């Protein structure tokens, strides 16, 4: 029974009308419907989408039993629907039991809250389905937090970790954690734009605490608008849809205050021709120094409010600035004021880019027992203090953790259960090899030794996929 692409949303709307929380998701799908339908038709012309098996897919939304996560769920469901899969949407324990009770489930999209429910509801046979799980986890899960016993040994108290999955089963909001898979979402998209209009990113007064100098510098050159705080700020209150599309289409500069971290909104601003003023974090913010991140299953350090925007887009669309550097902020605002407007969206955040990525994952990513192909492997040695993530990135590659097993001249050697191996002491030519295959980790820098690191190429604008991965 083969998957046939769908070009009509009538059935999708009927499914999402069964859950009150999808109300504004259905609205957004209608706004984006022509983009989605154009994209599934264009993909089907570029690539053979024939002879794909129709999968029975459980989509269990633990969080419905977070706007960015609701957007990601909406875009995932829409992608599955367009690709012709048999979607069973669950937002209750009752639904979960019924769907799994019926059997034939081939693929499971769930969040970590939903996974706790899955385990509790199904009992010990929950692990029978473990290889079919794709776990929507916005901020990502590094191997040291996923391995229950290693995490306990290191004193990690995360309520989110210790699931003992293959870490590539965690599906992230941005491609920030190469131990994981990047799922993302779709970003909704010069006489319109008011050259001197800036708009503050942040719907609560709390976000604005101790930003006055920053805002005062911006206010020297631009009107400061808000949707929520100095007297001069022009507040439009809470908005949406066409209205917010208009306000962003009207705005030259979208102003970050530091929070929230890694949201969709800066990408929507850039897609609508805005530049993003992106606060720089020195030191970088992590579960080690930031209350928001304490208990999150990663030590990943954020170098700015939106590191994807900073690293994968950059100027002129994204100015990553020290808020405390008055010279730097003024230079940035004056630059943006004089910039030519260039609306931009990375391919991977388009309808067709997301359809291509999720179709590849559905067809090629299998944890139930080779992809990416071993031809993609390029091995790099991380210097001491450098992670496998870093040394791949430094060569315009990305760490590919599925190649660690193929990397596991050595005068002596030993075995260790540690996220930092395989390692090489090139002084005494001593090799330490991985003794616990669940501890293979792109994340982590050896303090003394070189790390032996598995990298792969990526399609520019589609970092989730190697050139030979389609
Ligand atoms: C959307 C999402 O999950 N996104 C990210 C996530 O982001 C964080 C997350 O926080 C969700 C939690 O927020 C509050 O702490 C609570 O509302 C909590 O709800 C549980 O706990 C409260 C009491 O604290 C209860 O009132 C509520 O019923 C619920 O109880 C819990 O129920 C579950 C289901 O059975 C049970 O399994 C738990 O044991 C039980 N917990 C307790 C202690 O009783 C929320 O869970 O979402 C926020 C926005 O919604 C974000 O800002 C947060 O950063 O982060 C993770 C990890 O990084 C990521 O994987 C995920 O994608
Ligand atoms: C910004 O420019 C527009 C037109 O160029 C004008 O209407 C507006 O008054 C200006 N704002 C400030 C604060 O000077």
UniProtKB/Swiss-Prot annotation:
Query: Could you give a GO molecular-function term held by this entry?
Result: manganese ion binding
GO CC annotations? extracellular exosome; Golgi apparatus; Golgi membrane; membrane
Q: How does activity depend on pH?
A: Optimum pH is 6.5.
Superkingdom classification of source:
Eukaryota
| Glycosylated residues, chain numbering | 196
Q: Which residues of the sequence carry a binding annotation for substrate?
A: 137-138, 296
Report whether Zinc shows up as a keyword of the record. no
- Which residues does the annotated region (Important for activity in FGF2 release) include? 51-56
- Which BP terms in the Gene Ontology apply to this protein? positive regulation of cell migration; positive regulation of receptor signaling pathway via STAT; protein N-linked glycosylation; protein N-linked glycosylation via asparagine; viral protein processing
The listed locations are: Golgi apparatus membrane
Q: List the disulfide bonds.
A: 131-368, 388-453, 392-455, 399-442, 410-431, 466-469
Arranged from A to Z, the UniProt key words for this protein are: Disulfide bond, Glycoprotein, Glycosyltransferase, Golgi apparatus, Membrane, Secreted, Signal-anchor, Transferase, Transmembrane, Transmembrane helix
Q: What is the effect of changing residue 268 to A?
A: Loss of catalytic activity
Q: Which residues lie on this side of the membrane: Lumenal?
A: 1-470
Q: What is its EC number?
A: 2.4.1.155
Q: Hey, which family's this protein in?
A: Belongs to the glycosyltransferase 18 family.
Q: What is this protein called?
A: Alpha-1,6-mannosylglycoprotein 6-beta-N-acetylglucosaminyltransferase A
Q: Which gene encodes it?
A: MGAT5
Shown segment, full-protein numbering: 214 to 741 of 741
